[PDB]
């Protein structure tokens, strides 16, 4: 097989049709299903795989208690074909409390981060063997995209950050060839905080939309040049900003260059993508909690800082049902790159005190040129009934 290149144009998307759902938490109530969080989807040339950071335990288990902590020695990157729930036969790809993965066209690259908070190790595992590793450069929770990396002509790119979350962070973009780190670029341009980038191939470049945990409720864009490792960055101009928390749509605003400061602090991993000057994007329906999930196209919302003309709205999870992270992934169709996205559907602690564990289902949608209808595909588990 040749290295991936994504040279095909992006599909004429008119909205997202449903593609998959796991029911992991519904199955957990009578099954040995893994406790997870920070799930993501990535695909080899033949089929898609779901990944998640497993809390080193099944859900109906003593070890599922206090699984709300995001960093422990036991977290491992679970991998399955998409839709196969994470049952006990699931492969733990690597030790990891933060990670990213991507098939380069020849084999899987995983970036698996683990260790002490003050001194984490990132392990680059390519073709199923550890090829490289790099130590935390700012000694303050080395962390990565919690979603697919992107590879073009073999050079995978992964955005990694170190340093303070509610303050000025140090971010580097690692260029990886068959797991060997070939180059590293420090973040440049005007993005002031850059957590958890959802990347998508945008040949010849890779583009990523991230989480400003510090000052932006608008999302930062990182625009990465694979042929010369140059980085530039900016923000999602849409007046309908993608992060959570944010000001409501009546009062929110954005800037193409700066964090908009409006409810800037904290955030949620999300996504958006360009469609000429229009921007497709997905966000929680609520602006102060990760309840619901919606997607829409904002007319000129990629280029114009003042635009609030949404069109093609779709509820994916209604405003009563919890969501969580979400992330674009790209699927190479016959003659265009489709943009799919996933939504983590977090359940349990600390919002739902009815159970001792915290876990997630996922639901996955793909861009469609064809028509589509309506629905709501929440997690669906009844936490009043299942194991506390």
């Amino acid at each position: 097989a040749e290295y991936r290149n994504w040279s095909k144009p992006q599909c004429d998307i008119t909205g997202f049709a449903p593609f998959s759902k796991d029911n992991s938490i519904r199955l957990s109530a009578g099954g040995d299903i893994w406790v997870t969080r920070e799930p993501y989807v990535s695909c080899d040339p033949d089929k898609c795989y779901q990944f998640a950071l497993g809390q080193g335990t099944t859900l109906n288990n003593v070890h599922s208690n206090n699984t709300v902590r995001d960093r422990t020695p036991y977290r491992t990157l679970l991998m399955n074909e998409l839709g196969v729930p994470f049952h006990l036969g699931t492969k733990q790809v690597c030790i990891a409390w933060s990670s990213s993965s991507c098939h380069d066209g020849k084999a899987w690259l995983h970036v698996c981060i683990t260790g002490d908070d003050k001194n984490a190790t990132a392990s680059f595992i390519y073709n199923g063997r550890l090829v490289d590793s790099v130590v935390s450069w700012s000694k303050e929770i080395l962390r990565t995209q919690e979603s697919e990396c992107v590879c073009i002509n073999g050079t995978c790119t992964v955005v990694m950050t170190d340093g303070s979350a509610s303050g000025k962070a140090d971010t580097k973009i690692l260029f990886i060839e068959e797991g060997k780190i070939v180059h590293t670029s420090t973040l440049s341009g005007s993005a002031q905080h850059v957590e958890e980038c959802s990347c998508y191939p945008r040949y010849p470049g890779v583009r990523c939309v991230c989480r400003d945990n510090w000052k932006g409720s608008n999302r930062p864009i990182v625009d990465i040049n694979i042929k010369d490792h140059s980085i530039v960055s900016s923000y999602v101009c849409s007046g309908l900003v993608g992060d959570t928390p944010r000001k409501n749509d009546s009062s929110s605003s954005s800037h193409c260059l700066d964090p908009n400061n409006e409810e800037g602090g904290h955030g949620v991993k999300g996504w958006a993508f360009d469609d000429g000057n229009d921007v497709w994007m997905g966000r929680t329906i609520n602006e102060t909690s990760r309840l619901g999930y919606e997607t829409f196209k904002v007319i000129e919302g990629w280029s114009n800082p003042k635009s609030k003309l949404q069109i093609n709205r779709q509820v994916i999870v209604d405003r009563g049902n919890r969501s969580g992270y979400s992330g674009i992934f790209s699927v190479e169709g016959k003659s265009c790159i489709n943009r799919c996205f996933y939504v983590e559907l977090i359940r349990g602690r600390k919002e739902e005190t009815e159970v001792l564990w915290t876990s997630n289902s996922i639901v996955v949608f793909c861009g469609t040129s064809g028509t589509y209808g309506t629905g709501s595909w929440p997690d669906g588990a009844d936490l009043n009934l299942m194991p506390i």
Partner: antibody, heavy 127, light 109 residues
Framework: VQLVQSGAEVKRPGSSVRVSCKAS????????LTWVRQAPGQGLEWMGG????????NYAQKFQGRVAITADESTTTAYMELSSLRSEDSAVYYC?????????????????????WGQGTLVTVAS | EIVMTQSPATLSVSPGARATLFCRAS??????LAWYQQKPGQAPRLLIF???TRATGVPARFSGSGSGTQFTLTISSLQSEDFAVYYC??????????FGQGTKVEIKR
């Protein structure tokens, strides 16, 4: 729990000041240690704190890039060095425990409230 | 940055009587809120956390209530010990952990 701080300070502008806080045995393994300011007529103002396993320190917007907070379990003392002092910084500085044990890189901090406070160090900044 | 606001600034109240101190947040802080007493010149003293749980050293006469954007500290019968400044403070999810400008509970006569 008990905390005791360095005596009062008088300092020249542009200089630094290094307030110390000796906490009781094992404190830095259980509670985030934090520094909270009180300007003479004003309200309380958190400067930052240090996480009680990793020793990672997090600072408030107004002080980030000029305060340093550090701690040593050999002496169970924590220190705040405040740089580029100006008369605005004339305030009482309290060290305080924060119940927050841990930081989720996604969900932020739980329980960041201050059950135990040092006696407070008066810092004055004048020419 | 969430902005805490307290009223009234100077809650003048007689001894033995009840006092109630109001605190507002510029957005919902859930129940992630605390109240600190402060005698003139002493370090602050935690009274309430989680908007209603009393702290370790706190007598029955102090009780906290409310959730979301509005909160109240109730002082059921003031002893001479209680005339102090009271600071509100959120601890909801993310920095900065802003305090209120504080309410002075004066002795009314």
């Amino acid at each position: 729990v008990q905390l005791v701080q360095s005596g009062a300070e008088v300092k020249r502008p542009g200089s630094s000041v290094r307030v110390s806080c000796k906490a009781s045995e094992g404190t830095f393994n259980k509670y985030t240690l934090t520094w909270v300011r009180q300007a003479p007529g004003q309200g309380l103002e958190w400067m930052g704190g240090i996480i009680p396993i990793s020793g990672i320190a997090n600072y408030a917007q107004k002080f980030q890039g000029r305060v340093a907070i550090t701690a040593d379990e050999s002496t169970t003392t924590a220190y705040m060095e405040l740089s580029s002092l100006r008369s605005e910084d004339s305030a009482v500085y309290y060290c305080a425990t924060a119940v927050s044990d841990y930081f989720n890189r996604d969900l932020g901090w739980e329980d960041y409230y201050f059950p135990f406070w040092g006696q407070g160090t008066l810092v004055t900044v004048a020419s | 940055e969430i902005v805490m606001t307290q009223s009234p600034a100077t809650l003048s109240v007689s001894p033995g009587a009840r006092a109630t101190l109001f605190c507002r947040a510029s957005r919902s802080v859930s129940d992630n809120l605390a109240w600190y007493q402060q005698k003139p010149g002493q370090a602050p003293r935690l009274l309430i956390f989680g908007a209603s749980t009393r702290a370790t050293g706190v007598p029955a006469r102090f009780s906290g209530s409310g959730s979301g954007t509005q909160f109240t500290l109730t002082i059921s019968s003031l002893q001479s010990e209680d005339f102090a400044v009271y600071y509100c403070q959120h601890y909801n999810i993310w920095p900065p952990w802003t305090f209120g400008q504080g309410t002075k509970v004066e002795i009314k006569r």
